[PDB]
Nucleic acid binder design. Structure first.
Ligand code: NA
Ligand code: NA
Ligand code: NA
Ligand code: NA
Length: 328
DNA sequence: CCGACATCGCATCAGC
DNA sequence: GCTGATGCGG
DNA sequence: GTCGG
């Protein structure tokens, strides 16, 4: 991809606008509009010279073209400069960086005078469990995870899962599975031959419990019968700086829907969009759970049997593609 | 013009 | 107390 | 905010 030096000024501007839409104005669709614009621009191999030039790109409309014209001629955007200095808005926007604190909680906090982590620290009683954890690890959670650490994390997860029951099947998905050099968190998909879409409730708990027993999992954000969201940390060596705490999610999925799950959670997002498109034009409907045939009138039929990622590709006459080649 | 922009598990709130 | 809505995250 | 039926 082109160096940020090309249109970084523009993409940074659009991303900042995106955050305020989401966190302050609570306009999620505008947040995504701005993100989409930033992405299409971020991949444009030419230094943009005008809003008109950018408008030709899908996702960039009249308004963003105008803002780009203003940024190119002045080196800034008045509305953004203004919002940045706004003490209330900048505080609301900031607080949402705490996991567990969304637009609603952030606005409530600021309305009562709680505007900083310091203020949050002084008001533990007004934070729920999730938020306290997000605060506790505010810094760690914003750090990325090197692939080498992800490999050490995977070693632990796979080992402990097999130790609980050798029949469990666990797959670390996400960009990591596509071979990325760094990850933002760890996403683990878990299944067991004993759990199917039509056949019975503690399969997840036993794995979470073992990971806690060996002190890999350190905190729990949420945990149910099919989904666990929490925190983990690699063991540190003597006299060695401790590793940052990391976010890890573990999902229990029915065996017959496992590979549709692995495919989906491996992505990338652009690849899934494409594959779902091709699958459609081929007469199939693919979601994170199953792949079903589409009748003449568009009536989806029963889900087709899947025993591997390949089965999916085969159904839609597509050559199986390696995770490292699913960038798009 | 004006609706879509994904959908759902879990924690917690709001209403009865 | 139970049931549905909301907030949040992914 | 952008797209498109
Ligand atoms: Na455009
Ligand atoms: Na956030
Ligand atoms: Na947050
Ligand atoms: Na065994």
């Amino acid at each position: 991809a082109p160096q940020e030096t090309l249109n970084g000024g523009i993409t940074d501007m659009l991303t900042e606008l995106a955050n305020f839409e989401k966190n302050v104005s609570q306009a999620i669709h505008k947040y995504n509009a701005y993100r989409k614009a930033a992405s299409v621009i971020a991949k444009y191999p030419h230094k943009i010279k005008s809003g008109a030039e950018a408008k030709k790109l899908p996702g960039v409309g009249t308004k963003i073209a105008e803002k780009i014209d203003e940024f190119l001629a002045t080196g800034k955007l008045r509305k953004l400069e203004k919002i940045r200095q706004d003490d209330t808005s900048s505080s609301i926007n900031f607080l949402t960086r705490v996991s567990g604190i969304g637009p609603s909680a952030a606005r409530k906090f600021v309305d009562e005078g709680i505007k900083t982590l310091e203020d949050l620290r002084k008001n533990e009683d007004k934070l729920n469990h999730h938020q306290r954890i997000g605060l506790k690890y505010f810094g760690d959670f914003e750090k990325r995870i090197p692939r080498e650490e992800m490999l050490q994390m995977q070693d632990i997860v796979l080992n402990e899962v097999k130790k609980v029951d050798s029949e469990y099947i666990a797959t670390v998905c996400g960009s990591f599975r596509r071979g990325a050099e760094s990850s933002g968190d760890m996403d683990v998909l878990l299944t067991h031959p004993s759990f199917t879409s039509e056949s019975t409730p503690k399969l997840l708990h036993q794995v979470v419990e073992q990971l806690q027993k060996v002190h890999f999992i350190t905190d729990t954000l949420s945990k149910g019968e099919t989904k666990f969201m929490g925190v983990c940390q690699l063991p540190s060596k003597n006299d060695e700086k401790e590793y940052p705490h990391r976010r890890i999610d573990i999902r229990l999925i029915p065996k017959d829907q496992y590979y549709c799950g692995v495919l989906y959670f491996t992505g990338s997002d652009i690849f899934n969009k494409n594959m779902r498109a091709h699958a459609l034009e081929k007469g199939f409907t693919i979601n994170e759970y199953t792949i079903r045939p589409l009748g003449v009138t568009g009536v989806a039929g029963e889900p087709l049997p899947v025993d591997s990622e390949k089965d999916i590709f085969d159904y839609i006459q597509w050559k199986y593609r390696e995770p490292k080649d699913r960038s798009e």
